[PDB]
Structures are given as C-alpha cells and as structure tokens.
Design a protein around this ligand. Structure first.
Ligand SMILES: CCCCCCCCCCCCCCCCCC(=O)OC[C@H](COP(=O)([O-])OCC(O)COP(=O)([O-])OC[C@@H](COC(=O)CCCCCCCCCCCCCCCCC)OC(=O)CCCCCCCCCCCCCCCCC)OC(=O)CCCCCCCCCCCCCCCCC
Ligand SMILES: CCCCCCCCCCCCCCCCCC(=O)OC[C@H](COP(=O)([O-])OCC(O)COP(=O)([O-])OC[C@@H](COC(=O)CCCCCCCCCCCCCCCCC)OC(=O)CCCCCCCCCCCCCCCCC)OC(=O)CCCCCCCCCCCCCCCCC
Ligand SMILES: CCCCCCCC/C=C\CCCCCCCC(=O)OC[C@H](COP(=O)(O)OCCN)OC(=O)CCCCCCC/C=C\CCCCCCCC
Ligand SMILES: CCCCCCCC/C=C\CCCCCCCC(=O)OC[C@H](COP(=O)(O)OCCN)OC(=O)CCCCCCC/C=C\CCCCCCCC
Ligand code: HEM
Ligand code: HEM
Ligand code: HEM
Ligand code: HEM
Ligand SMILES: Cc1cc(C)c2nc(SCc3c(C)cccc3-n3nnn(C)c3=O)sc2c1
Ligand SMILES: Cc1cc(C)c2nc(SCc3c(C)cccc3-n3nnn(C)c3=O)sc2c1
Ligand SMILES: Cc1cc(C)c2nc(SCc3c(C)cccc3-n3nnn(C)c3=O)sc2c1
Ligand SMILES: Cc1cc(C)c2nc(SCc3c(C)cccc3-n3nnn(C)c3=O)sc2c1
Ligand code: FES
Lengths: 49, 378, 62, 147, 51, 48, 71, 378
C-alpha cells in the first residue's frame, strides 16, 4: 500500500482534506499575537493557483 | 520571508492599514474621517478638469462657465459634481468635529491642534472658489469681505488693494483669487498626512472613553470592509443630488452676471457660511465683527484646558448631553437667521443666539462637569 | 438532511481563487445585454409620445 | 467601477467633435476660384479644394506606370475628374509649399529637393509614400460633404 | 549560466504555464476594456458597448 | 442646438436662411453680409 | 544602520586637532601645484586619446562636405 | 530629553539628513543628486507662473508667449529661466548616470531600476513642453514623432489620432499636450522619493568600491555645507546664461510661427535629443527605428547582469577606463551628426557610431573585465 503512492496521489488527497476547509484551533498563553480566525481561514486558500 | 514585513515599501502599508490595532466597538460616527479623504480627492480631480476651460477675466469669467455646461462634452456633470461635492465636504466636516467634541477626542493634543488649522484652510479655499464664476453673489460676496477687511487698524487698507491686482475690479483681478484657490487644497493634503501621523502614536478613542488595549482587532478585514460600504453609501447620496436636483442647494441670483449697476434683492451666502454671517451682523462695529468671527473657530483650541470632568466622554454624563444638543440647536438657529433680512424679530434673536454660543462653551460646560463630579463623590 | 442549492460553484472555480478575482473580467459580460431591458425601456415607457424619436416620423418623410 | 468610469472619458477631448456640425458637415461653396490653393482653418490643416480644368486630366494620365514608385492614381481615389481633395502634410516630415510654384505644375518643396504634384503624387525623394487623401462621400449635388 | 538550469526550473514552469497563459490572456482581454480597442471590440459582436 | 430636439437638420438650415447676418472683413470688399450658416447664435435685438 | 552598530574594530588610535587651533591655508600654492601635476599625469593617457579621435573625424568630416559642392 | 530623537516628525528628519552615516571620501561627483533636486523644484515654480498666462490654442499659442516677454512684469526673466533651466537639468542628469556607471553603483538593484524609469519620464516631459510655443520646430518636431508613432503594427494609428484631440492641429489639439506636460513632473517627484527610500537601506557607494562602515561621518555638518556650496555655484552658471546669453542654446527658427504652407531649411531638435535622433536616421525602416531608439535607454537595465569583474568600481581597472571614455566620445559624435544634414560623409559616420554604442556595452566591456581577472589571477 506504500508502493502505490506517487506525487499525484499525494497532490490529490491533500487537496481533498486541506484546501478550503475550516480548521479548529486551540491556544494557551501568552497568545496576544495568535492571528485572528478570519486571517487563519484566509490562509487556507492560495494566491497564484 | 513574509514579504509584508520585510519589504521597505510594504512595511509602511502594513503598519498603517493592515496590521494596525483598532478598538472593537468603534461606531459609524468613526466613518467620517475616510469620507473626508474621499471628498478631498474628488474635489481635486474634478477641479483639475474645470481649470483647463476656465478664464480668469471679469469680461469672460461668467461666459466661460456657461460654455462648459453647454459645449464641452460631459462638462455639465463635472461642474455640478464640483458644486455639490463641496456641500458634501462641509457636512462631513461638521459631523467629524462634533464627534470629537462629544467623545472627548481633543485630549489627543497634537491631533486636535492640526485639525483646527485644517478647518481654517478649507473655509478660505471655498470662499475663493465662489468668487470665480462672477455672478451677483460672487460680486457682492467679495466686496462684503474686503470692506470688512479694511478695518484692520494698521495694515488693513494695504491688504485690500493687493488681492484685486492693485486696481478696483478688472481682468488681472481674478488671477490672484484663482491662484490661491488652486494652491490651498494641496496644502490641506499635506496637513492631513501629519494629522494621521500623530494619531498613529496612540491609536483611536472609542465611545466609552476607556482605554481598550485588552480588546484590539486588526484593521483588515474588519474596518476595510466597513469603510468601503460607507463610501458607496455616500456616492449614492451625492449622485441623487447631481442627477435629480442639481440646483437645490444653490441660489438663483448667481445666474445673473455681476453688475455694479444693477441691484440684488438680498445677500445670501452658501448654507455652510450662514452661521458665521449671523454673528457678524450682530456686532455694530467693524473691528469687533471680524474679531468675533475669528474667535468662533479659535474657541475650539481652548477645549483641552476647559475640561473639568473626571471622565473622558459624554456617554455616562447625562447633564453634559443636554448642553451638547443645546449647542447644536443653537447653530441651527444661527443658520436660519443668517438667511433672513435685517428687521425687528430677526435682530434680537440673532444677537441673543450669538451670546449663547459663547456662554455654553466657556461658562456653562465647565461648571456642569464639576456638579457631576460632586454627585459621584469624584 | 437534504440541503439547498448553495454549492453550485464552491468546488470547481471559486475555490482556486482564480475565478474569485477573475469574475471582474471574465465576469464582465452580458449584463449590458440584460439592463437595456430595464432602464432604457422603463424610460421610454414613462414618457410615451413625448420624446423626439417618437414624433420624428412626421417630418422624416422624404 | 470599470465599464463607465474609464470607458466613457475620451470624447471631451476625443473622436466626438465639440462643434458637431462644423466643416465635414458644411455646404462648401466656391470658397476659392479656379486654379488656386488657398488655406482654410478646418480639419486642422487646410484641405485644398480646387476647381479642376479640362486638360489637367491629361497632365495626370500622360504619366505612365513605371518609375512613380507608389501606384495610387486619380481615376480611383476621387470619384469625379473635375474635383479633388487634398491634405496639407508631406509623408515623411510634414511640409507643403507656397502656392502656384513648380516646374511641370505641382508644389515644389524647398527643404532639400522635393516637389509634390497637384492631385497627391510624388516624383522626388526622400518622400516614402503618396499624399493622405481625406475621407469623403459625394452624396449631394453641390453641397459638399467631404467626410 | 547553470545556476538556473536543471530539471527543477522548468518543472515549476510546466506547472505555471496554465498560471501563465492566464497571466497573459487576461491582460490581453484586459487591454480592450481600457482604451476601447475597436478593431477587437466586435471580435465577438455581442458587445455593442459604443451606443 | 435645435437639431434632434424640435427640428431636423433640414428645417434648421432653412430657418437660419430667413435672416441674413453681418460677416467680417475681406479683401476686394468690406465687412460683407450673408445668410445664416447654422453655426450662428440667435440674432440680437438692439444695436448697443 | 546607526553609529554604534556598523562594524567591529580593534587596536586603532586617532589623533585630531580643534579647528580654532589651526591655520586656514598652511600650504596652498606650494603643494597645490605639484599635487595636481601628479593627478594629471596619472589620468591623461586614459582620457585624452578617445577625444583625439573625435577631433580627427570632425576635421575630415567637415572637409568632405565642403568639397562636394564647387569643384 | 533629546527632542531630535523623540518627536514624531523630527525623528524622520534626523534619521534622513542629520545623523545619517556617510563615507568620508565622497567626491564632488556625488554632488549632482541634490543638484537634480534643485533643478526639479525650480522648473516647477517657474512653470506654474507661465501656466497662468499661456493659452493652448493653435491660433493664439505663439502670441501668448510673446505677450509675457513684452507685457507681463518680470515675464522675460521667468520665461528664459524655464528654457535654460531645462538644459541645466539634462546636463546634471547625464553626469549623474555616468557616475553610477563608472563606479558600479548599479549594484544597488532597486535604486538603479527606479532610476531608469525616471529617465524615460523626464525625456517625455521635455518633449511635450517644446510643442507648446508652436513655432516651426514645435510643428515639424511634433509631426516627425507622430508619423514615426504610426509604425506600431496593431494599435499605432489608433494612438496618433488621440493626442491631437481626434484630428489634425486645432484649438483642442494642444490641450492634451499641455495636460500631460503639467502632470508628469509631479509623478517624477513621487518616484524620486521612493528612489531615496531604497538607497537608505544600504547607504552610499564610494570611489574605491570597497565597503566603509569602519569610516563613517555624520551627514551634518560635513555634507550639508558641501552641498550648499555646489548649489550656489550652479545658480551662478545658470544666471550667466539667462542674463548674458539667453538665446545661445536655442534655435532661431522657433521665432517664426508654425506654417504648414511655409518651409524650414533644416530640422534640428534641442541639443539633448540630438543623440537619439542620429540613431533613428541610420535605420532605413520605421519599425526598426523606433525600436532602436527605445533600446538605447533600456540597455541600462542590463548593466547588473553584464558585470563580470571581481571588483566593483573602475578606479583600479585601467583597461575598462579606456572603454568608458570611448563611449563618452561616441555620444559626442552622435550629437554632432544629429545636427548635420543627410549627405554622404555624415551618413556612414552616423551608422558606424550607432553600431559602436551597442558593441561597447554588450560585447567589449564584459570580455575586457574577464581579461583583467585573469591578469590578476582572480
Ligand atoms: C494644552 C493645549 C495643547 C498643547 C499644545 C501642544 C501640542 C500641540 C502642538 O504641536 O502645537 C503646534 C504649534 C504650537 O507649538 P510650538 O509653536 O511648536 O511651541 C514651541 C515649542 O517650544 C517648540 O518645541 P517643539 O517640540 O514643538 O519643536 C519641534 C518642532 C520642530 O519640528 C518641526 O517642525 C519639523 C519641521 C517641519 C518643517 C519641515 C520643512 C518644511 C516643510 O516640531 C513641531 O513644531 C511640530 C508641530 C508642527 C506641525 C506642523 C508641521 C508642518 C508640516 O502650532 C501653533 O502654533 C498653533 C497650534 C497650537 C496652539 C495651541 C497652544 C495654545 C495657544
Ligand atoms: C510618495 C510615494 C510615491 C508612491 C506613489 C506612486 C509611485 C509608484 C510607486 O510607488 O512605485 C513603487 C513600485 C510599486 O508601487 P506599489 O505597488 O504601490 O507598492 C509596492 C507594493 O508592495 C507592491 O508589491 P511588491 O513590490 O512589494 O512585490 C514584491 C515582489 C515579490 O512579491 C511577490 O512575489 C508576491 C508575494 C505577496 C505580495 C503581496 C503582499 C500583500 C499585498 O514583487 C513581485 O515580484 C510580484 C508582486 C505581486 C504581483 C504584483 C501585482 C500585485 C501588487 O514598487 C517598485 O518599484 C519595486 C521596485 C523593485 C524592482 C525590482 C528590482 C530588484 C530585482
Ligand atoms: C451647521 C450645520 C450643522 C449640520 C449638522 C446637523 C445635524 C443634526 C444632528 C441630528 C442627529 C442626532 C443623532 C442621533 C443620536 C442620538 O441622539 O442618540 C444619542 C447617542 C447616544 O450615544 P452614546 O453617547 O454613544 O451613548 C450614551 C449613552 N447615553 O449619542 C450620539 O449618538 C452622539 C453622537 C455624537 C455626535 C456625532 C455627530 C455630531 C452631530 C452633529 C454635528 C453638528 C456640529 C456640532 C458642532 C460642530 C462644529 C463644526
Ligand atoms: C575627482 C577625481 C579626479 C581625479 C584627478 C583629477 C585631475 C585632473 C584631470 C581629470 C581626470 C578625469 O576627469 O578623469 C580621471 C578620473 C579618475 O578618478 P578615479 O575615481 O580616481 O579613478 C581612478 C582611476 N585612476 O576619472 C573620473 O573622475 C571619473 C569620473 C566619473 C565619471 C564621470 C561622471 C560623468 C561623466 C560623463 C557623463 C557622460 C556619460 C553619459 C551617460 C548617460 C547615458 C546615456
Ligand atoms: C480635511 C480635513 C480632515 C481629514 C481628511 C481628517 C481625517 C481623519 C481621519 C482619517 C481620522 C481617523 C478616522 C476617524 O476617526 O474618523 C481622523 C481622526 C481625527 N480627527 Fe480628523 N480629519 C480632518 C479634519 C479634522 C478636524 C477639522 C478636526 C478637529 C478640529 C479633526 C480632529 C480629529 C481627531 C481628534 C481625530 C481622532 C478621533 C478619535 O480617534 O476619536 N480632524 N481624522
Ligand atoms: C477642498 C477643495 C475645493 C473646494 C471646497 C472647492 C470649492 C469650490 C466652489 C464652492 C466653487 C464655486 C462653484 C460654483 O458654485 O459654481 C469652485 C469653483 C472652481 N474651482 Fe473649486 N474647490 C476645491 C478645489 C479645487 C481645485 C483643487 C481646483 C483646481 C485645480 C478647483 C478649481 C475650480 C475652478 C476652476 C472653479 C471655477 C469653475 C466653476 O465655477 O465651476 N477647485 N470651487
Ligand atoms: C530626477 C531624477 C533624479 C533625482 C532627483 C535623483 C536623486 C538622487 C540623490 C539625491 C542621490 C543621493 C546623492 C548622490 O549620490 O548624488 C541619488 C543617488 C543615486 N541615483 Fe539618482 N536621482 C535621479 C535620477 C537617477 C537616474 C536617472 C539614475 C540611473 C539610471 C539614478 C541612479 C542613482 C544611483 C545608482 C544612486 C546611488 C549612487 C551611489 O551612492 O553611488 N538616479 N540620486
Ligand atoms: C521637469 C520639469 C519640466 C521640464 C524639463 C520642462 C521643460 C519645458 C520646455 C523645454 C519648454 C519649452 C520652452 C521653450 O523652449 O520656449 C516648456 C514650456 C512650458 N512649460 Fe515646462 N517643463 C517642466 C515643468 C513644467 C511644469 C511643472 C509646468 C506647469 C505647471 C510647466 C509649464 C510650461 C508652460 C506653460 C510652458 C509654455 C511655453 C513656454 O513658456 O515657452 N513646465 N517646458
Ligand atoms: C477603505 C479604506 C482604506 C484605507 C486605506 C483607509 N485608511 C484609513 S486611516 C487608518 C489609521 C491610520 C493610518 C493611523 C491611525 C489610525 C487609523 N484609524 N484607526 N481607526 N480608524 C477608523 C482609522 O482610520 S481609513 C480607510 C478606509
Ligand atoms: C475663515 C473664513 C474665511 C472667510 C473668507 C469667510 N467668508 C465667509 S462669508 C462670504 C460670502 C458673503 C459675505 C456673501 C455672499 C457669499 C459669500 N460666500 N463666498 N464664498 N462662499 C462659499 C460664500 O458663500 S465666512 C468665512 C470664514
Ligand atoms: C543642502 C542639502 C540639504 C539636504 C536636506 C540634502 N539631502 C540630501 S539626500 C540624503 C540621503 C538620504 C535621504 C538617503 C540616503 C542617502 C543620502 N545621501 N547620502 N550621501 N549623499 C550624498 C546623499 O545624498 S542631499 C542634501 C543637500
Ligand atoms: C523617450 C523619448 C521620447 C520622445 C518623445 C523623444 N523625442 C525625441 S526628438 C523630438 C524633436 C524632433 C524629432 C524634431 C524637432 C524637435 C524635437 N523636440 N521636441 N521636443 N524637444 C525638446 C525637441 O528637441 S527623443 C525622445 C525620447
Ligand atoms: S521634408 Fe517634406 S518633402 Fe522632404
């Protein structure tokens, strides 16, 4: 099952699970510079592609 | 490499507009600062179009303005954008000053004192532009100011025969009115950059008056989207005036060309100069009239040292809020009186309301804040 | 749990952000096809028999 | 924020005229008698109208086909033999001479040795191509819509 | 030079020519909207923008 | 200014014809006279 | 980039004198003349020969435009 | 405290001009950057005076320029300041570029690439202003550019009937030439501020090419007094031209009004455009002429990647210095040829010197630096 994996399988399965998804976040202090949830959620989409 | 934090130009943009810490409870009374910056850019671009077709000569000044409204393509929409965009500038400016007075924003001392300078420079700019079309209000508006400007005791008559070119009224007369009016909006722009540089040292005030360093949010995206929405709602209202009522705020008497011979039935300035005109005509003197006109803008600079309350804003002060809207309802009275003729009822009402404008700011407000301190036991 | 038709375009094009900034250009089309059917036709209907091109058939008879 | 805020700002200064019915709309009269080219101040440079005589045709057709390096003849551009329309700039730099001077009947350019003909021909160097002919449509009998 | 040549340089160019012709064709159709390019205005005649 | 508002272009030249106007100076003449050219403003009614 | 953060340096000493302790012109035309004769001798053979080539082309160029005319 | 280091405005002035670390061995070839900033401010103030009395109409353009030299008070000194101040700008600009090329300053990549943009924008500005007086070189200069600007293959003839207002030359023709010429010097100012912001990241280069952090001195007082002295010596030379020879650099043929019917005996631009004009007339084509004119300014942007020497400046490279002044003596040849008529000797000399301008920069300079590396064993 490991020998079947190639670069196009990895490129496909990561887009299914990561690409425009809402994540869950937890933080324990000192966390004043932990970025806003809108700024985290915008980091899931891209600029060029 | 985050290029937003290491590039020499992108650092300045990121510190000023993107990652700036801002309070979370900012109202839409805090929208009118960027509305003023939109109104200034609009007046500059539209004014640079009108200046390629205007002629500053008292025989062809009125005729070059009728030519652009009839001959030049899209000249009628650009001319009435400029006249109505100036009323839009002055209504946002009066909201802006009344905000900073109610919430106590004058405690930012360097930001408040650059603002009082900016208020003088836009009032002088708008006066010069209303002389340039040369109808019968541009004529009888120019002479009322400059015979009031000959009552300066030692250099007064030196300064009145400088602005007309040296003569009484001629062609070279409106070259000096036009050149002042060209240059001053670009100094207003430089003073507004310094204005925001001093505010960047503290950040903003908020409606409670209480410091908010434990509750900041980034400026993008929360106030980038809230300021775009307020600007679109302002371009809607401006175009309702340009396209459905372009002559509602003006006066019909400025469609007659200037004539020292004929006679205008009344003297009425624009609506945003009518409050100052009512204070002038209540002083039977011409040195004490120009003094009380300049002292009604310069009284704003005494607001930091007249503050005797323990709290910063008026949100929790109910007696100071009755006096704040007595002052707004007194500037409405002085706008109405300034457009009336000088007879018996409108002569005592006009001077009893010029006294009340100085009695509220200088006497009744600092005494009322001390009574409130004593009812809370400080 | 049958949902409503929200996700027409969430997956194909408006996910790669390409068509999110392209819809100002690619998405510039066929609404100046569609709003002559509005403003122009409402304008000549409120003012019927009052405009020039209504009445110009009289002196245009050569 | 694009289709009407950049897309409509050209005409105040662009293709659309400000005088509308002006000069390519006019009723051109005999605004110059037979045999001269006098200046007029419209379409920028003087369009030179000329009353064309009965034997200026055989000044234009006696010249054959070989060494005039740009073939553009007078039976093809202007529809009538007894009518012509000219523009006042040369092809390379932009000069036109003082009127009625030349060897065989044209306009002699005193820059460095050129000579343009009457109906938009060049015999000389270093001019690359022929004369600009203006847009036209002879629609009427005698009220001239040249353009 | 050979600092930029390798199997990895045009690797990511073959991944970016779809992000390239989209760099180019959008700007190519962006150049008609700006300056009212009238010999490609009726390239497709459904845009009768000029009145 | 009346073409497309209440008159066509013909019916507008032929109304400018109806009053002849006072044009400017030329050689072999004077400031001469001529009918209306359709670029003329409406003719004024008192010498000065 | 401010002054106490630019580089690291060890074991060098500087001696200087006040401007009010000094003469304005110690040597002006007794070192000023032989020092510019050293700096001129160093530059001349790099700078001058290209401009001697513009001179010989200007002189030949404005001598085949005169004799083209009148035989 | 120290108010030079804690005030919000005075901090920026102190970091940029007072406490800035600068090399100690900076020559007077480094004077010409602030001379360019003096020449730009001078052209703006003088040009804003001429624009109140100029008329952009091809029947009254030549007559409004003779009026200011005869009627308006001090109009003759201000007009010839403007024409001669533009020659002063272009001579300081050519010294400035030749400095950065000899001492290797193009290695500051963001500073060099903003500079090549600034070189295009001042050349286009000076072209538009020489059309405005509308004499017989403003005419035959405008048409030579815009029939060369109809040889752009697909959008060329679209762009030529836009700048004349739609037409040939009329009253609305020089409103677009004038409006471009008004606006571009204020964009040049904004690009020169960004220019210095990127140089503040590294500081300056010096004549040796070697880094000098161990030998810095403060900018005040050592280069504040050295730059004031060079500016006074430049205002002396400019006034020698305005007051003792105001027509030395111009051409007499521009005192005849523009006439499509008359004929000018020659076509000669200003002296600082004569080198580009000689490259144009050596290409028998009109697409390959406008290409080789634009490729003679755009070749400056290839100087960072054509550098093959181990050292930064030319101070220690004696073979690269013979090639540097072969290139200067080749731009003098192209200035002379551009003011000559097109006959036999000046036609082969003109094209053999257009080849040598590209052969030195692209081929002979990168090969000579490799020979020098090999004689030093790197
Ligand atoms: C209580 C009421 C508020 C208290 C007022 C204090 C703060 C407000 C203020 O800044 O006043 C401005 C200033 C008054 O302060 P000041 O004259 O500088 O006081 C002298 C200080 O001792 C001189 O000390 P300094 O610390 O002011 O010296 C530094 C000074 C010098 O630094 C600079 O000015 C930078 C150089 C700018 C010019 C750049 C070159 C030219 C372009 O910096 C400034 O002056 C900055 C203020 C100028 C803002 C506009 C800048 C122009 C652009 O402006 C006015 O004259 C009127 C407005 C304030 C009047 C209120 C006072 C009651 C009467
Ligand atoms: C008074 C003040 C005067 C200002 C008035 C206007 C004057 C015009 C002006 O400011 O010119 C500055 C001009 C552009 O002005 P700007 O767009 O308003 O502001 C700069 C922005 O930060 C523009 O972004 P950037 O220059 O920092 O980008 C860095 C670099 C790398 O950036 C990237 O590859 C993308 C990374 C994300 C960037 C997005 C950051 C957040 C937005 O650029 C790229 O290769 C691609 C950039 C992304 C596509 C460009 C179109 C979107 C903008 O910047 C330059 O001249 C850069 C010179 C460097 C040339 C390269 C030579 C070294 C190799
Ligand atoms: C000269 C011509 C002047 C033109 C402007 C005329 C405008 C008329 C004002 C009418 C609008 C009334 C606003 C309605 C809001 C209201 O009253 O609700 C009270 C509400 C309660 O809010 P908080 O205090 O945050 O809560 C406190 C808890 N009690 O108060 C406010 O909204 C206060 C708003 C502050 C004022 C902001 C704008 C100022 C209004 C008028 C400007 C007039 C200028 C006055 C002097 C300026 C001189 C240039
Ligand atoms: C100060 C430097 C002066 C040195 C000695 C002075 C003695 C008098 C003779 C003048 C000599 C002279 O000018 O040239 C020599 C001298 C040697 O100086 P170093 O920096 O020491 O080089 C060391 C190499 N041995 O060379 C220089 O001064 C170089 C000058 C730098 C470049 C010149 C600046 C601008 C010059 C011309 C501009 C034209 C180019 C146009 C470019 C525009 C783009 C199309
Ligand atoms: C052309 C004129 C002006 C412009 C462009 C301008 C612009 C701005 C902007 C963008 C802000 C920040 C956002 C906001 O709070 O609205 C601001 C804040 C402020 N302005 Fe102005 N302003 C002008 C005139 C004035 C005047 C006339 C005054 C007072 C006399 C003034 C005093 C203030 C104060 C005190 C603040 C901070 C308020 C707070 O944070 O609570 N400004 N200005
Ligand atoms: C804060 C900015 C400005 C304000 C408040 C302002 C205000 C005015 C006003 C009230 C008028 C009278 C118009 C009328 O009632 O008919 C006017 C006219 C005029 N303004 Fe402005 N102006 C501003 C900026 C400018 C600028 C920057 C320029 C030129 C570069 C300009 C050029 C003109 C011209 C040429 C006129 C005369 C033409 C006309 O009357 O329409 N204005 N201005
Ligand atoms: C209006 C145009 C310009 C202005 C006002 C200007 C201004 C300045 C100033 C004040 C400096 C610092 C002092 C100095 O070294 O002289 C400087 C440096 C420099 N400039 Fe310019 N400049 C202009 C055009 C250009 C151009 C056309 C180029 C090159 C193509 C250029 C490239 C440079 C470089 C490379 C430096 C740094 C040189 C070094 O430190 O060795 N600039 N400029
Ligand atoms: C980098 C800045 C500038 C340069 C290099 C420049 C160059 C020139 C030149 C070469 C002329 C032709 C003058 C002659 O030979 O008779 C001219 C004319 C003129 N320029 Fe400028 N100019 C600059 C800035 C400005 C500015 C900023 C303005 C206006 C605000 C201006 C307004 C005028 C006017 C009105 C003329 C009228 C024709 C004349 O006076 O001769 N100029 N300019
Ligand atoms: C749409 C739009 C875009 C831009 C780019 C923009 N920029 C401002 S100015 C930001 C600012 C600065 C620079 C310094 C100190 C305080 C504030 N600031 N803080 N709160 N508020 C309401 C403020 O304006 S508004 C605005 C609106
Ligand atoms: C600081 C300041 C400066 C000035 C100079 C100023 N002037 C006035 S009142 C001028 C006026 C009159 C008396 C009569 C008719 C028309 C106008 N008038 N002139 N321009 N505009 C827009 C007008 O309404 S308040 C004021 C305040
Ligand atoms: C008389 C005078 C006055 C002033 C105010 C002035 N200002 C300059 S620009 C300074 C500068 C900056 C801002 C940034 C990076 C480098 C340099 N810099 N470093 N060396 N040199 C010769 C430089 O100009 S020259 C000049 C002359
Ligand atoms: C980047 C750039 C742009 C332009 C547009 C440009 N143009 C020229 S040459 C123009 C010219 C000719 C052919 C004949 C007579 C006079 C003038 N002329 N026009 N203005 N000035 C100061 C002149 O000397 S190089 C150049 C370089
Ligand atoms: S220059 Fe026009 S004919 Fe030779």
């Amino acid at each position: 099952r490991i020998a079947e994996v190639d670069a196009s399988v990895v490129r496909e399965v990561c887009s299914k699970y990561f690409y425009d998804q809402c994540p869950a976040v937890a933080g324990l202090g000192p966390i004043e510079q932990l970025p806003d949830y809108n700024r985290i959620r915008s980091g899931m989409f891209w600029l060029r592609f | 490499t985050n290029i937003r934090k290491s590039h020499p130009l992108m650092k300045i943009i990121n510190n000023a507009f993107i990652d700036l810490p801002a309070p979370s409870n900012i109202s839409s009374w805090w929208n009118f600062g960027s509305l003023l910056g939109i109104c200034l850019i609009l007046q500059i671009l539209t004014g640079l179009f009108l200046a390629m077709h205007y002629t500053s000569d008292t025989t062809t000044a009125f005729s070059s303005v009728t030519h652009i409204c009839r001959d030049v393509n899209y000249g009628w929409v650009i001319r009435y954008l400029h006249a109505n965009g100036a009323s839009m500038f002055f209504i946002c400016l009066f909201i802006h000053v009344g905000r900073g007075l109610y919430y106590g924003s004058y405690m930012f001392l360097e930001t408040w004192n650059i603002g009082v300078v900016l208020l003088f420079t836009v009032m002088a700019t708008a006066f010069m532009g209303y002389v340039l079309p040369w109808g019968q209000m541009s004529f009888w508006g120019a002479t009322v100011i400059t015979n009031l400007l000959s009552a300066i005791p030692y250099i007064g008559t030196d300064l009145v025969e400088w602005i007309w070119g040296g003569f009484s009224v001629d062609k070279a007369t409106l070259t000096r009115f036009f050149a002042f009016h060209f240059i001053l909006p670009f100094i207003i722009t430089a003073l507004a950059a310094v204005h925001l540089l001093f505010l960047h040292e503290t950040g903003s005030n908020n409606p409670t008056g209480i410091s908010s360093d434990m509750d900041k949010i980034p400026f993008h995206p929360y106030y980038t989207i809230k300021d775009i929405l307020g600007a679109l709602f302002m371009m809607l209202i401006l175009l309702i005036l340009v396209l459905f009522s372009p002559d509602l705020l003006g006066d019909p008497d400025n469609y007659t060309p200037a004539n020292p011979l004929n006679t205008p039935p009344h003297i009425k300035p624009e609506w945003y100069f009518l409050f100052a005109y009512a204070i002038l005509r209540s002083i039977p003197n011409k040195l004490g009239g120009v003094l009380a006109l300049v002292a009604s803008i310069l009284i704003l600079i005494l607001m930091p040292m007249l503050h005797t309350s323990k709290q910063r804003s008026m949100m929790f002060r109910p007696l100071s809020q009755c006096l704040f809207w007595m002052l707004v309802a007194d500037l409405i009275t002085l706008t109405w009186i300034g457009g009336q003729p000088v007879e018996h009822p409108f002569i005592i009402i006009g001077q009893l309301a010029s006294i009340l404008y100085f009695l509220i700011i200088l006497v009744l407000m600092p005494i009322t804040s001390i009574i409130e301190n004593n009812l809370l036991k400080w | 749990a049958a949902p409503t038709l929200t996700a027409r375009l969430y997956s194909l094009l408006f996910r790669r952000t390409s068509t999110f900034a392209l819809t100002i250009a690619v998405g510039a089309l066929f609404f100046e096809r569609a709003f002559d059917q509005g403003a122009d036709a409402i304008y000549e209907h409120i003012n019927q028999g009052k405009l020039w091109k209504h009445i110009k058939h009289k002196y245009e008879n050569k | 924020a694009a289709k009407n805020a950049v897309s409509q700002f050209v005409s105040s200064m662009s293709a659309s005229a400000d005088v509308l019915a002006m000069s390519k709309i006019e009723i051109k009269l005999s605004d110059i008698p037979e045999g001269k080219n006098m200046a007029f101040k419209w379409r920028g440079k003087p369009l030179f109208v000329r009353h064309r005589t009965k034997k200026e045709i055989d000044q234009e057709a006696a010249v054959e086909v070989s060494q005039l390096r740009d073939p553009q003849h007078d039976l093809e551009r202007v529809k009538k033999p007894e009518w012509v329309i000219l523009i006042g700039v040369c092809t390379h730099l932009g000069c036109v001479p003082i009127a009625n001077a030349g060897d065989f009947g044209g306009y002699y350019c005193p820059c460095h040795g050129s000579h343009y003909d009457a109906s938009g021909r060049i015999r000389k160097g270093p001019a690359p191509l022929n004369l600009e002919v203006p847009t036209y449509e002879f629609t009427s009998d005698d009220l001239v819509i040249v353009g | 030079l050979s600092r930029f040549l390798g199997p990895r340089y045009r690797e990511l160019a073959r991944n970016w020519i779809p992000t390239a012709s989209m760099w180019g064709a959008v700007g190519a159709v962006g150049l008609v909207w700006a300056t009212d390019w009238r010999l490609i205005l009726d390239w497709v005649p459904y845009i009768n923008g000029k009145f | 200014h009346l073409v497309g508002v209440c008159y066509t272009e013909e019916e507008a030249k032929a109304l400018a014809e109806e009053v002849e106007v006072q044009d400017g100076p030329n050689e072999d003449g004077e400031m001469f006279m001529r009918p209306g050219k359709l670029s003329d403003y409406f003719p004024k009614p008192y010498p000065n | 980039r401010e002054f106490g953060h630019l580089t690291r340096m060890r074991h060098v000493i500087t001696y200087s004198l006040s401007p009010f302790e000094q003469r304005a012109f110690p040597h002006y035309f007794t070192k000023g003349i032989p020092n510019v004769l050293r700096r001129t001798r160093a530059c001349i053979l790099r700078v001058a020969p290209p401009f001697v080539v513009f001179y010989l082309v200007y002189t030949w160029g404005t001598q085949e435009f005169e004799k083209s005319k009148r035989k």
